């Protein structure tokens, strides 16, 4: 998506 909770 745009990496800010899966990063």
């Known amino acids: 998506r745009a990496x800010r ?3």
């Open 5 to 7: 909770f899966f990063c």
